[PDB]
Design a protein around this ligand. Structure first.
Ligand SMILES: *P(=O)(O)OCC(C)(C)[C@@H](O)C(=O)NCCC(=O)NCCSC(=O)CCCCCC
Ligand code: NA
Ligand SMILES: [Zn+2]
Ligand SMILES: [Zn+2]
Ligand SMILES: [Zn+2]
Ligand SMILES: [Zn+2]
Ligand SMILES: [Zn+2]
Ligand SMILES: [Zn+2]
Ligand SMILES: [Zn+2]
Length: 77
């Protein structure tokens, strides 16, 4: 599996949205319906899976599925 597939799967699971709905251009809040808690829980789920901590101010600007995939490809070690 690819990072794209693994990140999309976690997002779908965390947000309770079907896979075909988690497109690379989808906005977590505007398109996937995420609320305040969802944001906190999503960020922590991805920090655990990919073993990397993201500054909260930085996570705040990651608004789309593609932005999350990019961060991960750029920071996981
Ligand atoms: P409530 O009213 O308090 O807040 C609602 C808002 C302010 C809209 C929050 O939901 C919010 O600020 N959302 C911003 C977008 C968002 O959900 N960002 C996080 C996406 S996942 C992420 O950034 C992690 C990527 C990888 C990190 C290391 C693995
Ligand atoms: Na693989
Ligand atoms: Zn595959
Ligand atoms: Zn849906
Ligand atoms: Zn909620
Ligand atoms: Zn663990
Ligand atoms: Zn945090
Ligand atoms: Zn802020
Ligand atoms: Zn590692």
């Amino acid at each position: 599996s690819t990072i794209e597939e693994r990140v999309k799967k976690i997002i779908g699971e965390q947000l309770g949205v079907k896979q075909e709905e988690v497109t690379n251009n989808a906005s977590f809040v505007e398109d996937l319906g995420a609320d305040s808690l969802d944001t906190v829980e999503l960020v922590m789920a991805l920090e655990e899976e990919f073993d990397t901590e993201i500054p909260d101010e930085e996570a705040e600007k990651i608004t789309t599925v593609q932005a999350a995939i990019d961060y991960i490809n750029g920071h996981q070690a």
